Amino acid sequence: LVQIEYALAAVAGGAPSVGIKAANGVVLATEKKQKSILYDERSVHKVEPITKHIGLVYSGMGPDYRVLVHRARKLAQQYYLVYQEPIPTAQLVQRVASVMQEYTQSGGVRPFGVSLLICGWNEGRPYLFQSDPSGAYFAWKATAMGKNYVNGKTFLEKRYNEDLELEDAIHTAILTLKESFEGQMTEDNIEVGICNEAGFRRLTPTEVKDYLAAI
Amino acid sequence: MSSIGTGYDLSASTFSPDGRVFQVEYAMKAVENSSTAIGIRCKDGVVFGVEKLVLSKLYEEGSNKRLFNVDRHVGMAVAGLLADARSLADIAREEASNFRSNFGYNIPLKHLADRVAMYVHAYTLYSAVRPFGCSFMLGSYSVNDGAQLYMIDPSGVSYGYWGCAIGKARQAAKTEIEKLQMKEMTCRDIVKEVAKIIYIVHDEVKDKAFELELSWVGELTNGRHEIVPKDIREEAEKYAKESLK
Amino acid sequence: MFLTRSEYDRGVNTFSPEGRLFQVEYAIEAIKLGSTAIGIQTSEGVCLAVEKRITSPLMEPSSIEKIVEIDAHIGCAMSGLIADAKTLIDKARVETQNHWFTYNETMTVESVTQAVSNLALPFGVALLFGGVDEKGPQLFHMDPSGTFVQCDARAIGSASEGAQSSLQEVYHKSMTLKEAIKSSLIILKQVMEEKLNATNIELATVQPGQNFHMFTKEELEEVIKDI
Amino acid sequence: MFRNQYDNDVTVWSPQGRIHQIEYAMEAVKQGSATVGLKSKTHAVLVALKRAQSELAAHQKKILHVDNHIGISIAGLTADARLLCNFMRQECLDSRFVFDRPLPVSRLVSLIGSKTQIPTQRYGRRPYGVGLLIAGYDDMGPHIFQTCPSANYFDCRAMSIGARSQSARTYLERHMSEFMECNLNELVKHGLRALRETLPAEQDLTTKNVSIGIVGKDLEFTIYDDDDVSPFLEGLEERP
Amino acid sequence: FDRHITIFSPEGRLYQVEYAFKAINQGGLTSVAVRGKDCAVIVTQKKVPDKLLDSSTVTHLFKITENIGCVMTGMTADSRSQVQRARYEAANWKYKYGYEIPVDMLCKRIADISQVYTQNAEMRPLGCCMILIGIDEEQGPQVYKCDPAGYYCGFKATAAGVKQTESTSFLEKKVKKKFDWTFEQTVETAITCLSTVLSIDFKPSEIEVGVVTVENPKFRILTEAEIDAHLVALAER
Amino acid sequence: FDELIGLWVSVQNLPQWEGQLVNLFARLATDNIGYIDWDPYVPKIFTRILRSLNLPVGSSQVLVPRFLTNAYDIGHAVIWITAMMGGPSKLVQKHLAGLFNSITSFYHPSNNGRWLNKLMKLLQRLPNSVVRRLHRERYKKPSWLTPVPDSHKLTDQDVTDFVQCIIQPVLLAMFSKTGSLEAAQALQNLALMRPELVIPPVLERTYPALETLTEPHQLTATLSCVIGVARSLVSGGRWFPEGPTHMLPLLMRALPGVDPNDFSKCMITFQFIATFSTLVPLVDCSSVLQERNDLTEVERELCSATAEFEDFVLQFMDRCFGLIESSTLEQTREETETEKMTHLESLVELGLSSTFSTILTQCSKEIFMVALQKVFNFSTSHIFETRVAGRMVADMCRAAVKCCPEESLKLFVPHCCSVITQLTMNDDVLNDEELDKELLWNLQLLSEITRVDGRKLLLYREQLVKILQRTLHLTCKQGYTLSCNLLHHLLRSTTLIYPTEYCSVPGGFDKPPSEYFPIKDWGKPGDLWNLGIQWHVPSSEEVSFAFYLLDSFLQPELVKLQHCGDGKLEMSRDDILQSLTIVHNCILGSGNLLPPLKGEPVTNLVPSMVSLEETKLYTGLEYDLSRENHREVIATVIRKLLNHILDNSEDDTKSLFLIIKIIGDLLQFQGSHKHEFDSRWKSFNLVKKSMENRLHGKKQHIRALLIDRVMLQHELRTLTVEGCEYKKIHQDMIRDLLRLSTSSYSQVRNKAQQTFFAALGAYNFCCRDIIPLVLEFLRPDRQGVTQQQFKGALYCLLGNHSGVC
């Protein structure tokens, strides 16, 4: 379909999201600039938990994004009803990309204009995944999304190594946003979430501020 | 003026580049090609008046009633397209019936008008339906809330009115209702005024025969909406004929 | 000859400014494509002739049916291929049998034609219901529009009008059934121009005495012995 | 040549404020043969002129039974008139079953209009290409109703629908001042003289093309066909 | 047909969603919400063009619950419809979940509904803007605004309508200069902002103010004598 | 001939050689017209042409077997038809009328089919070729080519009968569903020969079409078909005098076409108002009742309709204001902004600013001051966003500024300088990264207000450098970008050679005596000789302003970037990008002044026994060689800064691109862009062909495109530089470029290769110069180049579609 390529055009116009799979965890940093000072930046969140162990982030269209945040969380908890076990990250990406593929097959709708970076931690082992608006999903070591994702994907390919820790992966995920930020990021205009063995959590801005001070 | 052929005006499910839904506008332009219904609320009631055109001398002199009893305390004066107006008469009538069956009392005007303006609005955003081509006034009276007169256009907006006019000569009717102290007059003066305003805005050299239909609701009818007596109607007829001269 | 189309034809559900549905118009005057079929209603019974157009002598002539039995008192001759007609034929048979089940009586030819015409509401089959009920022998034409009408001689199919103009002339009210069968064969031989034998025409009669009866090969060739 | 952007479906308003599919269905009734309906104080007579596909075919029906008190006559698509007859017959049966009384004719006509407004507003469905002329008798006396493809219904003293029925309306409006005081035979002859003036100069009302439907006070709705229109046509005058 | 329905352009845009914001500007009216220390006000203008109209029925301030109010800007029937849907979702939150709906959850819910209009092709986006105010039990005053795109955000102040961009420039110069707060100033800021960009020097029959305060969280619609008590206090300074 | 045409007639197939053979007799018929009779042959040519049209005839009788593929192109069949008609026996005209009587059902808009693509070709090519025959016979001078005899020239009735036979398929094809293009060309060519038979039907079909609201397919048809009929409509022609009286009625009634809703009719309305305003001097010549005689009853009624020209250029302009006011952005996304302008709306500002500049050069000084006040109040008091709506207003403003430079600039430049000065005063706006958007709009307005006649702008010299002293170094990439293109348009207005007036009447048109008569001059086509182009050649005063403006705004940041190449000036990546942006717009504006790169010739390329010499074309400026060449110092600074970035800050994906652009224009750009000249050239032939008075043969054209053609000759002259010496300073430009062609990031490689491929077709024998340096990276034994250096060296070695390989 042509609407899938045009939906990928709305993803590449979105804000940068960078996710890096470290040895002991996965980061998911995004670009969150407010258009003016009138907007409460505390209010809306881009990095978003799905379970206690899976979070995700996007580039593209936020209202399309919340539709799959809601349905990822439903698929996850209806897995948990059946198995009483937290859902594997790869299984959840199969479910969500099946949902995201459904809106490309049916006529009278458009595809999602959103591409997800699903992170996870299951069985002592981290996961980085990207679901495209087609319904296709790819496992990643590190990747970029949104505005100039190509330049981010080759900035990551230079600074990625496998024996990398989670804190150093936060440091090189801030740098991949900072290669395209346009104007001096702060703890109030980016948003990072990490998975580790303790589960997924979105970093508090006081905790983002010290990572930014380390750079 | 000039036509448009890009086709933003073919469904109600489409905005124009300057932000209009033209199918709603073309339905509202179907209303201003119809004869004028006026409605005036007063100190003790709401009075309706329609210049019901008689486009064959073969009809039964009371055919095509553009005044409706939608509940026993609410009445409906329609302009625009009759078949759409009778559909909305059945909708407003069913909505009043369902309110009484569920909540146990008569439907309030401002709630009937909102629940019917929502139906009229729900036919203004889909490609499978078209907007209604009728604007209509709802007028009620009771004891607790006083006189109530709302008008609903094809867009689905309902506003309250002291006087109101819908149809092709609605503007000069707004003028000649604006020359009138409706907040202090009684219902029996407003019928004379409604009849003379209907007889002023009626161009006989375009559409040449009509029947003036009046309906009131108020204190004098115990809050019931009725057609009103032929005696009072023909006195209003004579005052409108003599008044015009 | 050339090409004469407008903006108001072949719109599937759209009136023209003269109140006409020309998508339906051209889909009714495309069911003239069927082979010719003449029914004649007489007082001695109704007769039904249709041309058969056998392809090969390896093919059974009794396997392409252009006159079917609706019930023992109603036959029907279609024009067009059988597979278009066969839901209408099965509907007619089921309606006669449901009318029998509820009412213990034979359904009239008009009511069978009305029950088919309800199911036709296009469907692209012209039918000729000929039969005998308590109103005597009756013949009913039902064009693909769904319009049915009693008619006491009617030709449907490829040369419907040229054969109908001949049926306007041979027919009279005091016509016997054998004269009707001979006249229908003469007009079939005219609109066919072939030699007339028991392999290119079917013929069936519904008489007030006997049931629906298809002519066999021996009984058919006695008719063309003097045509 | 002058191709119209707005006469595509029924759910499209023209910028002139009009719906062209409804307007174009309004002249599906002038594709039907003429039919006069007229009422007296006691009776309501539907006179229709019907045509044959050939001289051997048998004259398509136009007056149709709906109940013992309601009978209609049709002009336009006889396939839509069949939907309307099935609907109206079932409404008459439903209220003779629930209330054990005949329908008010105006309530059935209102119910027809509410039925036929629905394809004038919803996509992919055409307006009913028939106009009915509805005779009925009930508690309020006899009634003559016209329903049109615009889903607008008319209460009539007398009415003619169908092709070149202007001339009948020119007859009927001229003579409606004496319809109420007629007996039955004079009311039928008024309807016939209205129908006779929807004819060309060489044509005449015969027993094969005229169909007459009468309902009244002490009379159920009866359709007078071929032999039965002979008392009604063998009292008229020569064509003026 | 790529610009008629809500499908993507070749550069990834939804043109009907863009034209719904043009449709908001069709109303001619500008709304402003600002947020204080313990208060959040909404002010819109009340242009009544027809003088034999009941002006008590023309209002864009709507009660959603007792604690949540709402100013609407845009196509008016769309606005009443989105108000009825917000009132439904508020009552159903209270029924299913046992507590009053937060302002962010209601505004998120209405934006989630609006996304469906932006994604199915058979209906249009609903061309109007909702601004919700209300007092949160833990966060204080909340001002939330959802657009026909399905976005929502929380706002230190915001604006909706014809003069939205200049009202945003005014309030943006305002909220980086002071921390505007107190009951009186926040009505001052929302009256001055509307007045500055419309430039028409208000009389109280011409605007309408809706407030929530932390001291009494009931959504109030201001009396015309109370808009006088703010306009006289503002018009001599 | 008798051999070969007997061979032609005796076959009835469609061999693949008999279409070769009709290509031969069409060429024979044209070159020899008072000769071979064609009279035994014409009933066979015409009937084989009709068979070639392969129309479906009869009761569905089909031709799968029949030859549908070739043998009868109507390009040559038209030529062969039009070369046979004339002479004592028309026979050929009788057959031609019979042909179009045979096809008249198939030209009807309801009857479209696969035949219509070639039946439209007959209709668009046949009156054109008759125009060319009439020009060949009448208005072409005596020459060596064999002249047509008097016996076989087209007469009065012979061409009236052609118009009378062909026009009903043409009018029938006006309303075609394919798009009315090839009927408008027929209506153009038929109106050159018989305007009295052609124009009254098309405006009999135009005034209803432009009145209706249910048939919108007709407005696009009957306006595109009045474009081609326009030069005939505005002239009269001594047998259709009513002609023009139809202009300003039809011009006023077409104003609701300027519409936010239709792109499709707002294009044709702009293109209609632009073609019916170059054709009329819209000076208000209605105060002539002192002129009792010397006038025509048409010219009297046509000058007492001229007073509605304020009511056109103001009612037009509210139509153009509302289209801007609903052509704004309306940002729907929270995450990002759009910041670009789609193709569909960057045409309705080319059409807008095209027809508004076309109007405004064709209005008098009385009309212009009202239009200037209406421009100024709308741009001043209705503050605009800087992407799509303010892009439209500011180009509407510079139309008024480009017309009368001295009065319109007096309104904008004091206002915009004062309003920028009041909003830049706080001195914390330099390090503010947002720029509150009243500064954005007035800064955009002033940026585009200044690409105008530079002599008329040296008055506002002092207080316009002061607006650049403060805004260029302001850290916001909407605002130094809108202030360096202010510097761009200020240099190239002051440095470059361009005409200034483009009016239809030479060297005047704002003249106080209105006692003579401007509305007997509607048309006046061509006049190449008494043309009178007002050129802007740069004087010494404005060349001095350009070098001052270059020594005040290029030299400090050139010093800054030169220090940044050193171990001085640890400089920010957003600050390097800013300085390279100033340098790029300063070169890209002041290119014509500074002479190209020179140096020692590269040595060991090719033995060259004759000579290898560059062409030295003058182009009118006389390079100042006593000043320091400013290309060389900039190349010196950006090579060293390229070494700095490609070794210290590899990831700087934004400045690096500008190293690519500045190499690309140091090496190439001398005042004129190649792509802009190409776009202009393409536009010129489309405007020329749609107004081509083919029948007359002295290049008669609207003075506007005839001045634009001399500007194209100047741009073609300053743009073609031949095989100049490769000159080792250019070798370093292409060595360092390769280093960008094979770099870390794929986007800088892709943009770097396009200036690389353009560098190689510019210097003779330099593709051969770099063969072993592209090929270094793809050696098997050169240890460890990279993945991306290898991929870049073979993209470099692949070329592109239309350059070197």
Ligand SMILES: O=P(O)(O)O[C@H]1[C@H](OP(=O)(O)O)[C@@H](OP(=O)(O)O)[C@H](OP(=O)(O)OP(=O)(O)O)[C@H](OP(=O)(O)OP(=O)(O)O)[C@@H]1OP(=O)(O)O
């Ligand atoms: O320079 P361009 O853009 O390529 O176009 C040149 C053409 O190409 P060329 O110069 O050979 O490369 C050439 O046409 P052909 O040789 O192919 O027939 C000239 O024809 P010519 O003058 O000999 O022939 P006549 O005069 O038409 O009889 C000119 O055509 P016209 O306008 O009709 O001629 P006008 O220039 O008006 O006199 C035209 O001059 P413009 O620049 O104005 O378009």
